[PDB]
Amino acid sequence: ASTDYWQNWTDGGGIVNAVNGSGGNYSVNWSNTGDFVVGKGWTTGSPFRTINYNAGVWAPNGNGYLTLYGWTRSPLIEYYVVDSWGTYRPTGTYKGTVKSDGGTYDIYTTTRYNAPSIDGDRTTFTQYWSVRQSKRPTGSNATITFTNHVNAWKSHGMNLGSNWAYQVMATEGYQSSGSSNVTVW
To answer: Could you confirm whether 172 is annotated as catalytic?
Structure first.
């Protein structure tokens, strides 16, 4: 499908060279950054969407995540479906697991305190996570059947908000360097 949203946020630290490519393609070169999130997807997320992607390049030199990323409002929730990472595997409060698209994911919840949110400024909000137990190989056509995660999260009392914000396949980094090239559809 055609993506209609381009996400390019940085807290201003270091270098983040994000390129909005043709169609659903984008690339990012970063070094000695603070926090940043770059990706392509949809302006309005959906719990029934099936995301396809191909990471032609996934080379983080430190903390970085290759992950489905999005937000909901009422309540404010930042969610993730992490397929690969760099030197640090994200974790939090273990809830259970879910099998989807050939892999097994651990389900975690965490909370952010006085952190920047989608609406600007800072606040406290919950994060929902689905983290693959082992890194998903890149360079191939991958699929993320989001409904599987949404349903699994639901059975653990992890309900998403009613107002859906953007939903993208992103590259997130934290105080690191690296490169990525991803195509989303």
So the answer is: yes
Is position 168 annotated as part of the catalytic site? no
List all residues 6 or more positions away from 182 whose beta carbon is below 8 Å from its beta carbon: 25, 26, 27, 39, 40, 53, 54, 55, 56, 57, 58, 66, 169, 171
Of the candidates 163, 134, 130, the one whose C-alpha atom is nearest the C-alpha of residue 146 is: 130
DSSP structure class, residue 62: S
Secondary structure letter of residue 159 according to DSSP: P
Q: What amino acid is encoded at 99 in this protein? A: K
Resolution for the entry shown, Å: 1.5
Domain that holds residue 12: 1-185
Question: What CATH number is associated with residue 44?
Answer: 2.60.120.180
Measured at the alpha carbon of residue 184, what is the angle toward residues 89 and 150, in degrees to the nearest 5?
60
Q: How was this structure determined?
A: X-ray
Residue 78 and residue 96: Cα distance in Å, rounded?
A: 19
What does the alpha-carbon distance between residue 41 and residue 3 come to, in Å, rounded to a whole number? 5
| Residue among 39, 78, 98, 166 flagged as catalytic | 78
The structural domain count of the chain equals: 1
